[PDB]
Write an enzyme that holds these catalytic residues in place. Structure first.
Site, mmCIF file in Angstrom:
data_model
loop_
_atom_site.group_PDB
_atom_site.id
_atom_site.type_symbol
_atom_site.label_atom_id
_atom_site.label_comp_id
_atom_site.label_asym_id
_atom_site.label_seq_id
_atom_site.Cartn_x
_atom_site.Cartn_y
_atom_site.Cartn_z
ATOM 1 N N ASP A 103 7.346 -0.017 0.125
ATOM 2 C CA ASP A 103 5.964 0.051 -0.430
ATOM 3 C C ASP A 103 5.489 -1.391 -0.792
ATOM 4 O O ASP A 103 5.628 -2.304 0.049
ATOM 5 C CB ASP A 103 5.911 1.082 -1.580
ATOM 6 C CG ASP A 103 4.489 1.312 -2.128
ATOM 7 O OD1 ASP A 103 3.778 2.187 -1.553
ATOM 8 O OD2 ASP A 103 4.083 0.626 -3.135
ATOM 9 N N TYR A 157 -2.324 -4.473 -7.088
ATOM 10 C CA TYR A 157 -3.344 -4.050 -6.134
ATOM 11 C C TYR A 157 -4.631 -4.799 -6.340
ATOM 12 O O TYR A 157 -5.574 -4.577 -5.599
ATOM 13 C CB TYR A 157 -3.662 -2.577 -6.301
ATOM 14 C CG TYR A 157 -2.595 -1.596 -5.827
ATOM 15 C CD1 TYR A 157 -2.594 -1.141 -4.525
ATOM 16 C CD2 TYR A 157 -1.623 -1.114 -6.700
ATOM 17 C CE1 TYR A 157 -1.675 -0.234 -4.080
ATOM 18 C CE2 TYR A 157 -0.679 -0.190 -6.286
ATOM 19 C CZ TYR A 157 -0.721 0.240 -4.974
ATOM 20 O OH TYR A 157 0.196 1.144 -4.511
ATOM 21 N N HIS A 183 6.834 9.657 1.632
ATOM 22 C CA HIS A 183 6.607 8.311 1.150
ATOM 23 C C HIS A 183 7.755 7.757 0.303
ATOM 24 O O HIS A 183 7.966 6.554 0.286
ATOM 25 C CB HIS A 183 5.325 8.213 0.321
ATOM 26 C CG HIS A 183 5.165 6.871 -0.316
ATOM 27 N ND1 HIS A 183 4.678 5.773 0.374
ATOM 28 C CD2 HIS A 183 5.522 6.420 -1.551
ATOM 29 C CE1 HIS A 183 4.699 4.726 -0.433
ATOM 30 N NE2 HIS A 183 5.217 5.090 -1.596
HETATM 31 O O1 LIG Z 1 0.947 1.596 -1.945
HETATM 32 C C1 LIG Z 1 1.078 0.201 -1.665
HETATM 33 C C2 LIG Z 1 1.657 0.170 -0.279
HETATM 34 C C3 LIG Z 1 2.026 -1.210 0.215
HETATM 35 C C4 LIG Z 1 0.774 -1.795 0.714
HETATM 36 C C5 LIG Z 1 0.137 -2.689 -0.112
HETATM 37 C C6 LIG Z 1 -1.040 -3.236 0.355
HETATM 38 C C7 LIG Z 1 -1.548 -2.892 1.593
HETATM 39 O O2 LIG Z 1 -2.711 -3.541 1.908
HETATM 40 C C8 LIG Z 1 -3.774 -2.727 2.420
HETATM 41 C C9 LIG Z 1 -4.627 -3.797 3.014
HETATM 42 C C10 LIG Z 1 -5.019 -3.729 4.333
HETATM 43 C C11 LIG Z 1 -5.779 -4.750 4.858
HETATM 44 C C12 LIG Z 1 -6.154 -5.825 4.078
HETATM 45 C C13 LIG Z 1 -5.755 -5.897 2.755
HETATM 46 C C14 LIG Z 1 -4.984 -4.883 2.234
HETATM 47 C C15 LIG Z 1 -0.920 -2.004 2.440
HETATM 48 C C16 LIG Z 1 0.255 -1.457 1.962
#
Ligand SMILES: OCCCc1ccc(OCc2ccccc2)cc1
Ligand SMILES: OCCCc1ccc(OCc2ccccc2)cc1
Ligand SMILES: [Mg+2]
Ligand SMILES: [Mg+2]
EC number: 3.3.2.10
Lengths: 546, 546
Positions: free
Chosen positions: B334, B465, B523
């Protein structure tokens, strides 16, 4: 005026310079002079090398680009490159050839000690080779000695671009005129000079240090041999293991490789190993420096039997279990020394190798009650003083500073003899209120001890001495055995309690026993002769425990 | 009635029995039947073997005594022993041949799980051979699964002497009739029977387990495949490293060998790795299972920027520095997954190998603000909900039990979809007050999480986040690079956020990328399919990181 010193890595802090393998390879290979340096530098600000140094691409991506460059350079020079000419090979070899230039590190060290802010500023690369660990090890060993490490590939800028010198100044929180900057490349010094920094063009180290000495007014050349690196407690990884319900053990941990468990004596601390911890990690071991039961951040239950050797041993075994270590090398001093011989005798499968500083192995005498054995030696009289619960606690706890300042002394400074201590009424009856500081210890260091012993005082530590009989009965079970695992005894010429001759029969019980001996070294071995201790342990580790 | 079960090691918990190498050697070597067993047993109660088993002498001292015995035995049998016949050799070979008899361990395990007190009682020796580590490893792996290990050589008594069965009963705090005792040697069962213990003469395992099943009334044979060993938090070594003034990181540490740093996701814990920690230690790695910044016993500063990937990475590098680790394998899930790919891209020299569960590597899009990229995928809507400080904190902190019980669910149990979370007004708006317990977790385990999150709540975790833009700008610096160090991507068939297809372009950026894939796994990979996860990581470790 000068408040900061900045060193480059290649050719300043580390030698030979990898830039320099380009030159030597051409010679070795009878290639056109400069051919490799041209390929290295091809395209200048926009070429492969600058993107590498800026962190745009990694080393492995750059390797075939520099290959293409060598090919183009030799084509235009109307020559050929050897069969099996390999940039990967040349660079692998160059990068592992380069070592810390020790006198330059020591000059940086010394400047830091007189209050300079020190920094490494370097053009370097993101290294993703199979063999990258070599460089990671070098950087680790260097970076710990400086306030800042600034890497071209991390900040996205390179010497000689002016912005990186501004980044530098800004990181230092210094004006240009407070900074000396040393570099082996003149073009890289220039923008430092333009800002009015003092610069040193480093060709040979000694000349560069003479200039550095003139300009800073601090002696850097011909300085006496410095102490090994020590530990700052709040930079250590601190570990905790519960070995049974009321008992948890604390240790400090540094390095990777075979596990090496350090066991201090009375009345000491993991911190007693502060000079060996970095050196043994640096030498390729996983060091675990304990607070032994009774001390520091380990638990200190009150009951005497909590501290018989049997219990202490079973607990050290449990500590290995909970860490998932099938073995460790055990290295002990004083009480820790006695304990590791017992670990060897009762848990050989758990002991990779055993070593003791000062404490000889003496078998139990089955024909003599241990108190009596202790009474037969005037110099163990201090052990009898420790028997009566409360008496030694009160004297040792009364003034902690004075306690450690009176105990921790070199062989030519001593204020207390272990001689007729009971009769005199105590350990300190004939020592000063405020002893002078031993050469072996700073005021800061004494205060670390003082603070550690504020947690539990001396009851637990002293209990180590209060199970003579119990230890005797347990030890008697071991009288048919021998110690046949690898084993080192280190004697201390001037320890007037644990004298070298006390260890003279040990070969009978440990026929392959190895020895070291340190001259002009009192009872507090690790801090008295840290340098000799380190060398004797690493030599013995590398050959017997590795 | 029966409350305790006691197993022998040789021939019961471990196979083949070393007693049995005596028999096979005679056969292999065409020696007189029994010759070696006679030498082994020579002098009975007063012979070499019994002193060895009592801990009077060590294995290495016994070796030449058993040699003398073999010589005497062959002399009286009017035969010769082979040229280069070697007891050391025979025993070295026998001792490394013997493995845990897995079905017997699992039966002991199961009995312990239904409330039995379990013990190993064994005649064994103080082992001081060069190769003793092999046995120390076996004993370590076994002893953790039992309440007591009783070793002849530690208690100074041996089966079949009656006093050791009294010592046994006394250690168990049980009467004879509450105990089943299994042994491959009839003479050793006899005194157990005399006291009225239930005994099982173990020849083949399956028959012995059938008797054990009859007599205890618990199913031991044909039981479904059990979960891997989990961790009990208060038996772990707990580690602490200050990486800068307001920030200290906690980890749990088990095993020796190459360092393997486990990085959990949101909103989890070192404890999320509880099933991999023993398995990877057991497989020859030094596992470091972090609480990531924001969690558990690691620090949790409030400011959002404390949690951008850049800072988090530099901090993990510093953590290696203070531990004296030049590299580690980084394994993430994750958010931890995303972080380790970034460690690979910006600190390859510090990363021995990188692996991610569920989280694919996706490069930054330099042509699109990251919020917008996030908006293009309905299933990341939960990430937008997390933006506004306070909103997600209040919902997640409101009822901790309900939070983890609603989140931690297998793919067929789920109560919350990550779908139009903002619109709905929250993550739990359409889930129960008291969710049922997932098959993946016990009530005890949920409560561990609950207790961890009472320390800092969800502000720090959520901040992970809240640096989309900052991470975007930092990641853009890495767009020319590739990941060329060893790398494993593990996809989870039924993770409906981090779907397998999200990882499908990764070979473009990581051309030598290796894969694993787990079917019917949601998940929460590590606890959903612990067994498959362990196997995929160990296979990949052993071949790519070792
Ligand atoms: O729940 C967290 C999962 C791990 C995770 C963390 C961030 C992420 O960026 C999405 C994104 C997609 C595109 C640009 C910026 C961010 C994807 C997965
Ligand atoms: O200051 C502690 C030094 C380490 C040490 C600890 C105990 C010891 O036993 C004396 C003895 C001699 C004979 C029998 C019993 C005890 C010798 C050294
Ligand atoms: Mg240079
Ligand atoms: Mg047996």
């Amino acid at each position: 005026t000068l408040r900061a010193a900045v060193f480059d890595l290649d050719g300043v802090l580390a030698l030979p310079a990898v830039f320099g393998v380009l030159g030597r390879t051409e010679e070795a290979l009878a290639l056109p002079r400069g051919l490799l340096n041209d390929a290295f530098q091809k395209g200048g600000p926009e070429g492969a090398t600058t993107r590498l140094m800026k962190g745009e691409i990694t080393l492995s991506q750059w390797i075939p680009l520099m290959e293409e460059n060598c090919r183009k350079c030799s084509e235009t020079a109307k020559v050929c490159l050897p069969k099996n000419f390999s940039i990967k090979e040349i660079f692998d070899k160059a990068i592992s050839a380069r070592k810390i230039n020790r006198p330059m590190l020591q000059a940086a060290l010394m400047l830091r000690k007189k209050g300079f802010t020190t920094a490494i500023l370097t053009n370097t690369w993101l290294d993703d080779r199979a063999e990258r660990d070599g460089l990671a090890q070098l950087m680790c060993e260097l970076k710990m000695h400086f306030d800042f490490l600034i890497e071209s590939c991390q900040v996205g800028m390179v010497k000689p671009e002016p912005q990186i010198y501004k980044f530098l100044l800004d990181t230092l929180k210094a004006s240009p005129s407070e900074v000396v900057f040393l570099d082996d490349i003149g073009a890289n010094l220039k923008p430092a000079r333009d800002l009015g920094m003092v610069t040193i063009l480093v060709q040979d180290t000694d000349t560069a240090l003479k200039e550095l000495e003139k300009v800073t007014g601090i002696q850097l050349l011909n300085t006496p041999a410095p102490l090994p690196t020590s530990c700052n407690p709040s930079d250590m990884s601190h570990g905790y293991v519960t070995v049974k319900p009321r008992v948890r053990l604390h240790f400090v941990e540094l390095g990777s490789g075979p596990a090496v468990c350090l066991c201090h004596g009375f009345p000491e601390s993991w911190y007693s190993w502060r000079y060996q911890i970095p050196a043994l990690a640096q030498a390729g071991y996983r060091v675990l420096a304990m607070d032994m039961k009774g001390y520091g951040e380990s638990s200190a239950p009150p009951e005497i039997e909590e501290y018989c050797m049997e219990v202490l041993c079973k607990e050290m075994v449990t500590f290995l279990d909970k860490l998932g270590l099938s073995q460790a090398v055990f290295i002990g001093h004083d009480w820790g020394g006695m304990l590791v011989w017992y670990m060897a005798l009762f848990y050989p499968e758990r002991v990779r190798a055993v070593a003791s500083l000062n404490t000889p192995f003496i078998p139990a005498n089955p024909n003599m009650s241990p108190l009596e054995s202790i009474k037969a030696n005037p110099v163990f009289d201090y052990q009898l003083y420790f028997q009566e619960p409360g008496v030694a606690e009160a004297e040792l706890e009364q003034n902690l500073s004075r306690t450690f300042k009176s105990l921790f002394r070199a062989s030519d400074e001593s204020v207390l003899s272990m001689h007729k201590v009971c009769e005199a009424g105590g350990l300190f009856v004939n020592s000063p209120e405020e002893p002078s500081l031993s050469r072996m210890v700073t005021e800061e260091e004494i205060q670390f001890y003082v603070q550690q012993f504020k947690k539990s005082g001396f009851r637990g530590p002293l209990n180590w001495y209060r199970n003579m009989e119990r230890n005797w009965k347990w030890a008697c079970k071991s009288l048919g055995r021998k110690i046949l695992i690898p084993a080192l005894m280190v004697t201390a010429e001037k320890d007037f309690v644990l004298v070298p001759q006390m260890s003279q029969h040990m070969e009978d019980w440990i026929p392959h026993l190895k020895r070291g001996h340190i001259e002009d070294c009192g009872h507090w071995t690790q801090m008295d002769k840290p340098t000799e201790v380190n060398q004797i342990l690493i030599k013995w580790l590398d050959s017997d425990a590795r």
